[PDB]
Amino acid sequence: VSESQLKKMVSKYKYRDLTVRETVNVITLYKDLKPVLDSYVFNDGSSRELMNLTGTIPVPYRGNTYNIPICLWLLDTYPYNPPICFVKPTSSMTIKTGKHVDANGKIYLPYLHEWKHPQSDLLGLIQVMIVVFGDEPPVFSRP
């Protein structure tokens, strides 16, 4: 949660200072998003230690607010490349698949396909997720 501790976490990012600025603003507004350092595997099988933001974002739907659980991975060349985004349902939820979420919880949005720094950033992304998940929730509670 400390601005200096974060510099350490992303110390081998190409755009270290950009990445920290975005993360600081994001986690100051969306207080349930925690930065976490974990291994990420690419299609070829190579792994790199990367930061992600994990936790919930508040999404209004039919008059109530839900805390939808997500994980966003910042690649080490962030912000030139988009974050890779997942819904992370608990055992009480199930994924509703569609044009925007596959059965593994991967999220597909036009905002992600069309990413371009600096017209695109983490705040604008989260804003888009809230609107989209507010029309079509990606997780529903189980019976």
Binding site: D32, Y66, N67, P69, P89, F140, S141
Partner: peptide
């Protein structure tokens, strides 16, 4: 905060 999701009817 606890994760919640809307009920399906």
């Amino acid at each position: 905060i606890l994760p919640t999701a809307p009920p399906e009817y």
